Design a protein around this ligand. Structure first.
Ligand code: A1BC2
Length: 126
């Protein structure tokens, strides 16, 4: 069901949270080799999550589930904000700009925290 598809996408999202928090610890510790690997892992996780969210949104559209479509449109917009900040984080890592990396990291956390009440609303709407 689209609802089990959303649970699967939610689990992929929680996996990125776990890896993100491990990566933050590695960044603080100056373990740059670990950070590089975690950032590759996060890029794959976000790419997979984005694709699952699109399939869920398209399915809700095909189902005429207008409330779910509204919430998913808002959610995928916020998701792209996270993605842009993530990509900027990766560039800051490549550039050796630890100040920007710190800034982007905090921002990604607040964008992710803010978007959680909406994430729970979608689960109920689908
Ligand atoms: N963006 C936070 C403020 C800051 C200024 N300079 C920095 C160098 C490294 C770092 F992790 C953080 C900073």
């Amino acid at each position: 069901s689209v609802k089990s598809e959303y649970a699967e996408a939610a689990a992929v999202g929680q996996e990125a949270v776990a890896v993100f928090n491990t990566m933050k610890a590695a960044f603080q510790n100056g373990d740059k080799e670990a950070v590089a690997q975690y950032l590759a892992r996060l890029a794959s996780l976000y790419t997979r999550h984005e694709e699952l969210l699109n399939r869920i949104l398209e399915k809700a559209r095909r189902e005429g589930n207008k409330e779910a479509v509204t919430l998913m449109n808002e959610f995928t917009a916020t998701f792209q904000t996270g993605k842009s900040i993530f990509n900027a984080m990766v560039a800051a890592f490549k550039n050796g700009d630890d100040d920007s990396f710190e800034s982007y990291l905090q921002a990604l956390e607040k964008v992710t925290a803010k978007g959680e009440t909406l994430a729970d609303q979608i689960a109920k709407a689908l």
